[PDB]
Amino acid sequence: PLCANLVPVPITNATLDRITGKWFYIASAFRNEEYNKSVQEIQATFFYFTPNKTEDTIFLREYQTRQNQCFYNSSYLNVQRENGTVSRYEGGREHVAHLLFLRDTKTLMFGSYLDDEKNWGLSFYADKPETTKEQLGEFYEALDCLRIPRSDVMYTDWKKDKCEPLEKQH
Numbered sequence: 001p002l003c004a005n006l007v008p009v010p011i012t013n014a015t016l017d018r019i020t021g022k023w024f025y026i027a028s029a030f031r032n033e034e035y036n037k038s039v040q041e042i043q044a045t046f047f048y049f050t051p052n053k054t055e056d057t058i059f060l061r062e063y064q065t066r067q068n069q070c071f072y073n074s075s076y077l078n079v080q081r082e083n084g085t086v087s088r089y090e091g092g093r094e095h096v097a098h099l100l101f102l103r104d105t106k107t108l109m110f111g112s113y114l115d116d117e118k119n120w121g122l123s124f125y126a127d128k129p130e131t132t133k134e135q136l137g138e139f140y141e142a143l144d145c146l147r148i149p150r151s152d153v154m155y156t157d158w159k160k161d162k163c164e165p166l167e168k169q170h
């Protein structure tokens with residue numbers, strides 16, 4: 001069953017435990033042009049999830065590299081458990097994404113606009129800044145499911161990261 005993992009899955013405390021920690025933004029692709037535009041500029045990103053299960057929020061410490069600068073932000077994501085989504089209002093708009101999983105327990109994906117063939121996309125994250133060819137195939141196989149060509153994928157370059165020195169300064 002190839003595209004079974006693109007179906008929404010409710011978020012439990014176990015799910016929240018699973019995503020607790022440091023993750024690295026690996027790659028994404030979208031049919032939505034706004035997200036293509038903003039995500040293009042991303043050279044690298046790592047981040048921390050610290051869920052508050054009682055509040056259905058996730059504390060986010062984000063370390064983004066664009067134009068060879070480090071942009072650091074903290075904020076809370078809201079969790080909508082039945083729907084398997086997480087959200088965050090930012091720069092005017094509410095953003096929502098489905099939390100989706102691959103077979104590799106060391107990776108995760110966020111799904112944007114999943115209900116819309118004109119706008120859908122997937123972003124891929126791993127617990128290392130570099131991914132194995134196995135992890136990357138599971139991600140491509142999820143793109144294949146959304147009929148998004150592999151050549152549309154935007155990648156981070158862990159060579160380009162400027163945030164390590166701030167995260168340690170923290």
Ligand SMILES: CN(C)CCC=C1c2ccccc2CCc2ccccc21
Binds near residue numbers: 035047
């Ligand atoms: C282009 N982006 C927005 C694609 C979705 C990715 C995420 C995400 C994932 C991991 C760490 C931080 C963020 C921040 C942004 C945000 C806001 C709401 C829901 C999901 C998301």
